[PDB]
Amino acid sequence: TPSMMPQWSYMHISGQDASEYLSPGLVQFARATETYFSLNNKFRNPTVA
Amino acid sequence: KTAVDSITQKKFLCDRTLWRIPFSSNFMSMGALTDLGQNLLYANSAHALDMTFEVDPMDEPTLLYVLFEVFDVVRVHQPHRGVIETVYLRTPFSA
Amino acid sequence: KTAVDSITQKKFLCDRTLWRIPFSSNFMSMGALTDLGQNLLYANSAHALD
Amino acid sequence: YSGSIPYLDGTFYLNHTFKKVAITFDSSVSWPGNDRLLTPNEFEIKRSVDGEGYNVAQCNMTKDWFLVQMLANYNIGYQGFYIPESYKDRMYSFFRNFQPM
Amino acid sequence: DLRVDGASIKFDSICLYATFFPMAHNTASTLEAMLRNDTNDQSFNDYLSAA
Amino acid sequence: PTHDVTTDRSQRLTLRFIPVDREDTAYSYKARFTLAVGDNRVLDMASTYF
């Protein structure tokens, strides 16, 4: 990988998932009050064919 | 009884859309980032591109509108109160 | 080009409904039974209404 | 009289005649308190055409009341308004029968 | 065209508006702490997307 | 939920902000504002409309 390893992985273009690159506390918190105050639309989920 | 000899014209209308062409081995949409974007042969070097269009004639000046479907992302970070920092990344055509 | 001086009126129609005010601290609907109902400021004593 | 009966039919046509409403407990407190709302001590539905500090959506409607009704119907507004979803809003709802003229 | 037809316009007053969720205070401070650490930054991607 | 959602120390629900600087020309109309989100709150652009 002579070109773009942490660059591509940085912007969440490819690699991990929202439930994987966060502190456990934040994930638990989102699970808690997802109903009346959403947050999920604030972080990309990369997808690769 | 007294009809007359005729020929036929055919055409169609496709207003309110765009013409699309994906970039894959089989034109399908298997993911947000296609496979061929990750093929080395178009990824580890440089190449030149040529496009040729042929369209119906018109009477007055027109414009050809070309969109290169690409990636463009922004990331935002807030370390301390009262300071906000951002980084924009543009995919090919970032110059 | 011959029109005259004018003023403007505005109004609205919203037939076929009810006007609601729910019991909450933020007017949301987080459950059939609401907090301020359970809240001991209005779940421990008695008062009158106007 | 033998027309439609609003008290049982479900048809109402007199909502727009309200001006203002106030609530009080034991002659000392306002049910929405702690300065939650712009006109803290009383809900404002439609100001007279003159009171042009607080209209919304080109009708003669106060912002506060619009916000309150929208929220109490669909928990929408804390994340910016938009057309509510279809299934969540049925015929007798609020947003289906709102007309500005 | 509307430049030659004498259609004009004049802005007088402009204001700005916002609304807040009256979240529980300590919970709000917890959320702020949860979000200020670097490894939980935010990302966003315009739709259209292209040149 | 009974608690741990909504405080009751007095706080406004909606904020109105005034321009502090405004400039005009034949075509442009420029404005500036001091958006001051107070201590211990969270605000969402969404709810921002000129």
XYZ file of C-alpha atoms in Angstrom:
396
model
C 0.000 0.000 0.000
C 2.235 2.826 -1.254
C -0.587 5.390 -1.591
C -3.571 5.787 0.749
C -3.886 3.412 3.732
C -4.766 5.689 6.709
C -6.091 8.296 4.282
C -8.830 6.087 2.881
C -9.489 4.527 6.257
C -9.633 7.964 7.880
C -12.756 9.289 6.181
C -14.545 5.978 6.764
C -14.534 5.341 3.026
C -13.693 1.707 3.796
C -12.875 -0.400 6.817
C -14.639 -0.530 10.157
C -18.254 0.113 11.123
C -19.964 2.665 13.339
C -20.477 0.022 16.020
C -16.791 -0.775 15.812
C -14.778 2.464 15.834
C -16.420 4.115 18.842
C -16.090 4.036 22.587
C -18.464 1.511 24.172
C -20.061 4.270 26.206
C -21.268 6.152 23.155
C -22.723 3.029 21.563
C -24.563 2.164 24.758
C -25.818 5.741 25.006
C -27.134 5.642 21.448
C -28.878 2.362 22.209
C -30.396 4.128 25.198
C -32.116 7.208 23.766
C -32.252 6.418 20.062
C -36.037 6.768 20.164
C -36.734 10.407 20.953
C -33.336 11.810 19.946
C -31.508 10.109 17.095
C -27.808 10.149 16.341
C -27.241 7.344 13.837
C -27.322 9.555 10.795
C -24.190 11.364 11.951
C -21.549 8.746 11.082
C -20.752 7.075 7.778
C -20.970 3.312 7.365
C -18.565 2.344 4.582
C -19.646 -0.331 2.140
C -17.425 -2.105 -0.379
C -18.363 -4.569 -3.066
C -61.920 2.166 -48.402
C -59.810 4.959 -49.887
C -56.850 5.144 -47.531
C -53.466 6.289 -48.811
C -49.966 4.875 -48.691
C -48.056 5.903 -45.598
C -44.788 5.556 -43.738
C -44.102 5.629 -40.011
C -42.153 7.759 -37.551
C -41.120 6.649 -34.063
C -39.545 8.465 -31.121
C -39.733 8.828 -27.351
C -39.440 11.226 -24.438
C -37.398 10.770 -21.260
C -37.635 14.179 -19.627
C -36.663 14.908 -16.021
C -33.745 12.549 -15.414
C -30.078 12.092 -16.275
C -28.219 9.610 -18.434
C -26.201 7.271 -16.198
C -23.290 4.928 -16.869
C -21.841 3.026 -13.897
C -18.209 1.871 -13.759
C -18.094 -1.861 -13.067
C -17.350 -5.190 -14.673
C -21.059 -5.912 -15.058
C -22.777 -2.541 -14.668
C -24.405 -3.641 -11.425
C -24.470 -1.681 -8.171
C -22.979 -4.111 -5.675
C -21.763 -1.429 -3.284
C -21.119 2.235 -2.713
C -17.521 1.857 -3.891
C -17.367 -0.257 -7.021
C -14.814 -2.990 -7.511
C -13.023 -1.516 -10.501
C -12.246 1.572 -8.474
C -10.133 -0.787 -6.368
C -8.393 -2.473 -9.281
C -4.698 -1.689 -9.275
C -4.383 -1.244 -13.039
C -6.512 1.903 -12.846
C -5.181 2.772 -9.378
C -1.362 2.612 -9.287
C -0.529 4.781 -12.288
C -1.815 7.560 -14.531
C -3.857 7.386 -17.718
C -5.407 9.659 -20.330
C -9.081 9.681 -21.270
C -10.943 10.583 -24.461
C -14.694 10.950 -24.944
C -16.542 11.419 -28.229
C -20.205 12.428 -28.374
C -22.625 12.437 -31.302
C -25.971 14.197 -30.810
C -28.898 15.567 -32.788
C -28.344 18.988 -34.383
C -30.021 22.070 -32.970
C -30.356 25.653 -34.130
C -28.889 27.603 -31.193
C -25.918 27.194 -28.844
C -26.207 24.454 -26.240
C -24.120 23.102 -23.380
C -23.071 19.554 -22.603
C -23.343 18.799 -18.890
C -21.046 16.077 -17.557
C -21.029 14.837 -13.961
C -18.221 12.600 -12.726
C -19.791 10.597 -9.921
C -17.040 10.656 -7.309
C -16.370 10.756 -3.572
C -16.192 13.910 -1.485
C -16.208 13.641 2.291
C -15.715 16.000 5.201
C -14.656 15.235 8.761
C -15.224 17.487 11.765
C -13.515 17.409 15.162
C -14.027 19.510 18.306
C -11.145 19.129 20.761
C -11.741 22.067 23.096
C -14.563 24.473 23.790
C -14.553 27.283 21.270
C -12.395 25.560 18.643
C -13.652 23.534 15.680
C -11.452 21.850 13.084
C -12.292 20.206 9.770
C -10.631 18.259 6.975
C -12.137 17.934 3.494
C -11.073 15.079 1.276
C -11.830 14.979 -2.420
C -11.351 11.810 -4.471
C -9.881 12.052 -8.064
C -10.061 15.624 -9.314
C -8.787 17.056 -6.019
C -6.202 19.383 -7.580
C -49.691 49.883 -14.844
C -52.914 51.394 -13.555
C -53.343 49.513 -10.280
C -53.932 51.275 -6.990
C -52.622 51.353 -3.434
C -53.369 48.149 -1.591
C -53.076 46.239 1.655
C -52.899 42.520 2.382
C -54.829 40.109 4.585
C -53.836 36.611 5.719
C -55.652 33.855 7.597
C -55.949 30.083 7.800
C -58.359 27.167 8.037
C -57.672 23.950 9.954
C -61.034 22.226 10.237
C -61.432 18.554 11.114
C -59.114 18.045 14.100
C -58.698 18.879 17.778
C -56.337 21.203 19.586
C -54.058 19.274 21.940
C -51.780 20.103 24.844
C -50.016 17.099 26.396
C -48.625 16.725 29.891
C -44.843 16.577 29.642
C -41.673 18.456 30.375
C -40.925 18.779 26.656
C -44.307 18.147 24.984
C -42.937 14.966 23.419
C -44.672 11.573 23.646
C -42.299 9.170 25.365
C -45.018 6.900 26.730
C -48.709 6.439 27.319
C -48.196 7.421 30.955
C -46.149 10.580 31.307
C -43.481 11.647 33.752
C -45.181 14.699 35.214
C -48.097 12.428 35.933
C -45.702 10.219 37.848
C -43.659 13.181 39.032
C -44.228 13.748 42.721
C -44.740 17.500 42.193
C -48.044 16.389 40.647
C -48.219 12.862 42.110
C -48.071 13.441 45.921
C -50.532 16.248 46.732
C -53.628 18.096 45.496
C -54.372 21.440 43.852
C -57.056 23.376 41.980
C -57.235 24.440 38.349
C -58.209 27.535 36.387
C -82.041 20.887 13.069
C -80.986 17.798 11.195
C -77.533 18.345 9.721
C -74.248 16.741 10.593
C -73.587 16.602 14.321
C -70.052 17.693 15.266
C -70.355 16.332 18.789
C -70.672 12.806 17.395
C -69.716 12.877 13.730
C -66.066 13.825 13.967
C -66.430 16.957 11.826
C -65.333 20.303 13.240
C -65.106 23.642 11.489
C -64.579 26.287 14.179
C -60.955 25.847 15.228
C -59.756 29.089 13.767
C -61.837 31.268 16.101
C -59.520 30.923 19.106
C -57.203 33.761 20.081
C -55.404 32.943 23.330
C -55.547 30.494 26.226
C -54.075 30.526 29.730
C -53.694 27.880 32.444
C -53.114 28.367 36.160
C -52.759 26.204 39.274
C -53.923 27.597 42.617
C -53.759 31.174 41.327
C -49.968 31.335 41.384
C -48.261 29.278 38.677
C -48.358 28.848 34.894
C -48.397 25.216 33.804
C -45.629 25.859 31.305
C -43.218 27.751 33.516
C -39.518 28.413 33.875
C -39.769 30.576 30.759
C -40.040 27.632 28.387
C -42.039 29.545 25.779
C -41.673 32.894 24.055
C -44.865 34.247 25.557
C -44.216 32.507 28.847
C -47.479 32.882 30.727
C -49.975 32.149 27.953
C -50.124 30.232 24.690
C -50.450 32.409 21.594
C -52.226 30.821 18.645
C -52.793 33.617 16.140
C -51.867 37.213 16.792
C -53.893 39.906 15.139
C -52.426 40.869 11.760
C -50.803 43.834 13.541
C -48.615 41.874 15.937
C -46.074 41.022 13.277
C -43.160 40.082 15.507
C -43.870 36.359 15.613
C -45.590 34.948 12.524
C -44.603 31.735 10.741
C -45.110 29.976 7.408
C -46.827 33.054 5.907
C -50.033 32.394 7.832
C -51.002 34.560 10.800
C -49.726 31.961 13.253
C -47.349 32.204 16.184
C -44.293 29.982 16.006
C -44.791 28.561 19.481
C -48.195 27.057 18.807
C -47.095 25.554 15.515
C -44.121 23.941 17.215
C -46.188 22.584 20.083
C -48.853 21.058 17.882
C -46.356 19.507 15.492
C -44.413 17.946 18.340
C -47.399 16.645 20.272
C -48.624 14.998 17.115
C -45.442 13.392 15.806
C -42.434 14.135 18.067
C -40.990 16.205 15.217
C -39.164 19.508 15.434
C -36.116 19.121 17.639
C -34.265 18.014 14.508
C -35.705 20.497 12.037
C -39.131 20.339 10.440
C -40.040 18.319 7.364
C -43.080 16.624 5.897
C -44.030 13.893 8.379
C -44.215 10.327 7.183
C -47.384 8.973 5.627
C -48.431 6.105 7.878
C -47.774 8.091 11.042
C -50.237 10.777 9.869
C -53.780 9.655 9.087
C -56.914 11.472 7.947
C -57.925 12.998 11.271
C -54.417 14.266 11.982
C -53.249 17.880 12.180
C -50.937 18.399 9.233
C -53.290 16.929 6.645
C -55.865 19.692 7.139
C -53.806 22.875 7.485
C -54.535 25.597 4.934
C -53.004 29.072 4.762
C -54.738 31.695 2.603
C -36.983 39.385 -18.621
C -37.658 41.260 -15.407
C -34.911 43.878 -15.389
C -36.691 45.879 -18.089
C -40.152 45.493 -16.552
C -39.444 47.359 -13.330
C -39.771 44.487 -10.882
C -37.962 45.479 -7.700
C -37.388 44.278 -4.161
C -36.190 45.676 -0.841
C -35.119 43.747 2.266
C -35.718 45.438 5.608
C -35.220 43.141 8.598
C -33.372 39.872 9.114
C -33.156 37.734 12.241
C -31.839 34.296 13.189
C -33.616 31.469 14.988
C -32.718 28.286 16.803
C -34.207 25.839 19.294
C -32.722 23.720 22.063
C -33.572 20.392 23.649
C -33.908 20.973 27.396
C -31.818 17.900 28.137
C -31.003 16.909 31.705
C -27.964 18.944 32.616
C -25.569 16.294 33.911
C -26.535 14.033 31.027
C -25.647 16.880 28.688
C -22.227 17.245 30.283
C -21.721 13.504 29.964
C -22.584 13.673 26.279
C -20.192 16.563 25.718
C -17.390 14.604 27.340
C -18.353 11.579 25.255
C -18.077 13.640 22.091
C -15.048 15.869 22.636
C -12.516 13.024 22.538
C -10.881 12.838 19.139
C -11.650 9.264 18.158
C -15.372 9.962 17.880
C -15.301 12.689 15.257
C -18.099 13.289 12.765
C -18.253 12.576 9.040
C -20.705 13.656 6.405
C -21.118 12.928 2.651
C -23.021 15.115 0.204
C -25.463 13.206 -1.958
C -25.129 14.082 -5.577
C -21.398 13.944 -5.321
C -19.429 14.621 -8.411
C -17.684 17.196 -10.445
C -38.686 7.567 32.122
C -39.177 9.418 35.385
C -36.033 11.533 35.436
C -32.526 12.066 34.052
C -33.947 13.462 30.815
C -35.318 16.950 31.419
C -33.940 19.449 33.900
C -36.004 22.119 35.572
C -33.542 24.922 36.191
C -35.199 27.670 34.181
C -34.111 27.666 30.542
C -35.494 28.949 27.254
C -36.698 26.630 24.507
C -36.158 28.913 21.509
C -33.547 31.586 20.911
C -33.688 34.650 18.681
C -30.430 36.153 17.424
C -29.827 39.671 16.138
C -27.407 40.767 13.416
C -24.432 42.737 14.669
C -23.070 43.756 11.287
C -24.768 44.236 7.939
C -23.437 45.545 4.624
C -25.152 46.429 1.367
C -24.261 47.104 -2.258
C -26.065 47.052 -5.590
C -26.281 43.280 -5.544
C -25.011 41.701 -2.341
C -26.490 41.706 1.146
C -24.090 40.517 3.852
C -24.851 39.744 7.498
C -22.946 38.497 10.552
C -24.054 36.934 13.842
C -22.621 35.793 17.176
C -24.089 32.333 17.691
C -23.419 31.642 21.371
C -24.477 28.185 22.478
C -24.448 28.412 26.242
C -22.791 26.232 28.822
C -23.933 22.586 28.870
C -26.306 22.444 25.912
C -26.354 20.650 22.572
C -27.753 22.320 19.452
C -28.567 20.948 16.059
C -28.124 22.994 12.964
C -31.294 21.524 11.625
C -33.128 23.875 13.845
C -31.531 26.881 12.188
C -33.479 28.867 9.693
C -32.879 32.417 8.593
